[PDB]
């Protein structure tokens, strides 16, 4: 029944004032992209930074198993768009937020679907 809960541990270390994970790989891009959350090439709009996906994944960075039956990572090999105001902590952002399944934008950071 025991499982390491790294997501909870990182959220708690953040709340206690720990420095966010560094060296997430920020890409050069036009910043005129669709703004969707996780894409096959950088898609940052004017309000976002694009990062290499693997470097923004808590499980990739900590060298631990991904929390699903198949061990799959949906960031590695892709690019993640992070709101510029949140780009000091891309790992925390991807961990605390959810991608809207119909429009592909971050819930509360671009998703228009419930207006």
């Amino acid at each position: 029944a025991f499982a390491v809960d790294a997501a909870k541990a990182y959220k708690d270390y953040l709340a206690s004032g720990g420095q966010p994970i560094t060296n997430c790989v920020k890409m050069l891009c036009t910043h005129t992209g669709t703004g969707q959350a996780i894409t096959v090439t950088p898609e940052a709009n004017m309000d976002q930074e694009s990062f290499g996906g693997a470097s923004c994944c808590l499980y990739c960075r900590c060298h631990i198993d991904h929390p699903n039956p198949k061990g799959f990572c949906d960031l590695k090999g892709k690019y993640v768009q992070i709101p510029t105001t949140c780009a000091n902590d891309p790992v925390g952002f991807t961990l605390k937020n959810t991608v809207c399944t119909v429009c592909g934008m971050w819930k509360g950071y671009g998703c228009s679907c419930d207006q």
Partner: protein, 298 residues
């Protein structure tokens, strides 16, 4: 220096034709640094400028392109160069990377170990290497041709680079190899390319464009490295980040270059011309299979 808006500077052809003696590299702009855009890593900027320059060459770009990237790890445990390569290459390109030390990567597959342990069943369309041993920077010793990973790279090109394929292999004043320069004469064209963001360093990428599998020209590698240093010593390059701010035409164009299986007796001058123009890749199109040898001890 209208060079400041280019991604970098390629070695002018007349410098390649000299017979210079090897001298110490003494860069005027040594110790200067370019102003990188806010939050951008040197190695992201460097690979972006390398790829911007490769966009100007006649690279073969087939469907299901195969690219391998050596020296892709960083002391940060991530792979910035791999992330730029995956941004640059057409979606669906198979990208494999590798490094002596463990790292987290966006590549389709990653091998950890000395590159000499890496074997692949298939051939490759593009080989990128950033491998580098900082212990070669000993200014107090004779600067001879280095072997180590360069010996592996030379054999890997000869055995596993598809005809028509290309390479970009990082060198510096002290990290270089004469056979690798000699191998540049086995491509339709070659250069030594210096990124504008890192122009204060003696590093360059040795680029072989469109592999022909035979010597097109005979190059003495000790002379050519001396020529490269002479060029760098007499041609200060202004550090520049300018090209990083225009990414609108960054992605490598999917040319759909033809891929053919051909036996060596069928590579005629007509085929050699197509290869030389970036219009043909010669290799099988089977599955891509890689491995790393593991030494088992107590």
């Amino acid at each position: 220096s209208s060079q400041a808006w280019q991604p970098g500077v390629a070695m002018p052809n007349l410098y390649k034709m000299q017979r210079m003696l090897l001298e110490k590299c003494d860069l005027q702009n040594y110790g200067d640094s370019a102003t990188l855009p806010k939050g951008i890593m040197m190695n992201v900027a460097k690979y972006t400028q390398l790829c911007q320059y490769l966009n100007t060459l006649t690279l073969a770009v087939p469907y299901n392109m195969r690219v391998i990237h050596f020296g892709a790890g960083s002391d940060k445990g991530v792979a910035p160069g791999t992330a730029v390569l995956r941004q640059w290459l057409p979606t669906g390109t198979l990208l494999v990377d590798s490094d002596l030390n463990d790292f987290v990567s966006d590549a389709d597959s990653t091998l950890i170990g000395d590159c000499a342990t890496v074997h692949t069943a298939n051939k490759w369309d593009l080989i990128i290497s950033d491998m580098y041993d900082p212990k070669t920077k000993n200014v107090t010793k004779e600067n001879d041709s280095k072997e180590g990973f360069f010996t592996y790279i030379c054999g890997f090109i000869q055995q596993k680079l598809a005809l028509g394929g290309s390479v970009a292999i990082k060198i510096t004043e002290h990290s270089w190899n004469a056979d690798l320069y000699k191998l540049m004469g086995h491509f339709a064209w070659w250069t030594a390319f210096v990124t504008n963001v890192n122009a204060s360093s003696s590093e360059a990428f040795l680029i072989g464009c469109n592999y022909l599998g035979k010597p097109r020209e005979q190059i003495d590698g000790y002379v050519m490295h001396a020529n490269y240093i002479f060029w760098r010593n007499t041609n200060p390059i202004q550090l520049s980040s300018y090209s990083l701010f225009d990414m609108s035409k960054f992605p490598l164009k999917l040319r759909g270059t033809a891929v053919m299986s051909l036996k060596e007796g069928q590579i005629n001058d007509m085929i050699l011309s197509l290869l030389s123009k970036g219009r043909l890749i010669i290799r099988e199109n089977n599955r891509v299979v890689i491995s790393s040898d593991v030494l088992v001890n107590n």
